Ligand binder design. Structure first.
Ligand SMILES: C=CC1=C(C)/C(=C/c2[nH]c(Cc3[nH]c(/C=C4\NC(=O)C(C)=C4C=C)c(C)c3CCC(=O)O)c(CCC(=O)O)c2C)NC1=O
Length: 139
């Protein structure tokens, strides 16, 4: 189930991602150009239940990172966008993956799936919604 996410991905499309980042209160300097950012993801999994994801943030800041979690187990995150007290939990909803972050009383959601070969993520903060899609690297 998670297996279909594993691999290396490069951005292909980005939609309203700068306004999304602006919507979660991310700094202007970090929100500006958000759809021009080219992250590379390195996704792996273990026992069908734990996942690891290394991100190479790429130009210009190279805020490279990694997250490790278990499906269901809430964990603490320290996001590029500079928020605090962030608790995140990831769970399978059917064949989609659902990622929820909570901080400062607030809630944002990330829904990721596979769509004609592309890893597609819909980001939701309120009714501010962004979409980005990744194609296999480099194939
Ligand atoms: C299969 C599951 C899956 C997971 C778990 C996954 C996680 C994931 N995807 C991204 C890209 C990444 N980066 C950012 C934010 C930024 N990007 C920039 O260049 C800058 C400056 C910012 C900060 C303002 C977000 C919101 C995301 C998540 C959206 C995405 O996956 O593309 C991150 C880094 C977010 C951060 O550094 O705080 C993580 C942990 N991607 C997947 O496909």
């Amino acid at each position: 189930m998670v297996e279909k996410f594993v691999g290396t991905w490069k951005i292909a499309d980005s939609h309203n991602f700068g306004e999304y980042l602006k919507a979660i209160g991310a700094p202007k300097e970090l929100s500006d150009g958000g759809d021009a950012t080219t992250p590379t993801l390195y996704i792996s999994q273990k026992d069908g239940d734990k996942m690891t994801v290394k991100i190479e943030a790429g130009p210009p800041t190279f805020l490279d990172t990694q997250v490790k979690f278990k499906l269901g187990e809430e964990f603490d995150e320290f996001p590029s966008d500079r928020r605090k007290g962030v608790k995140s939990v990831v769970n399978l909803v059917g064949e989609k993956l659902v990622y929820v972050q909570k901080w400062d009383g607030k809630e944002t959601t990330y829904v990721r799936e596979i769509k004609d070969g592309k890893l597609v993520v819909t980001l939701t903060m309120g009714d501010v919604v962004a979409v980005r899609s990744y194609r296999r690297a480099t194939e």
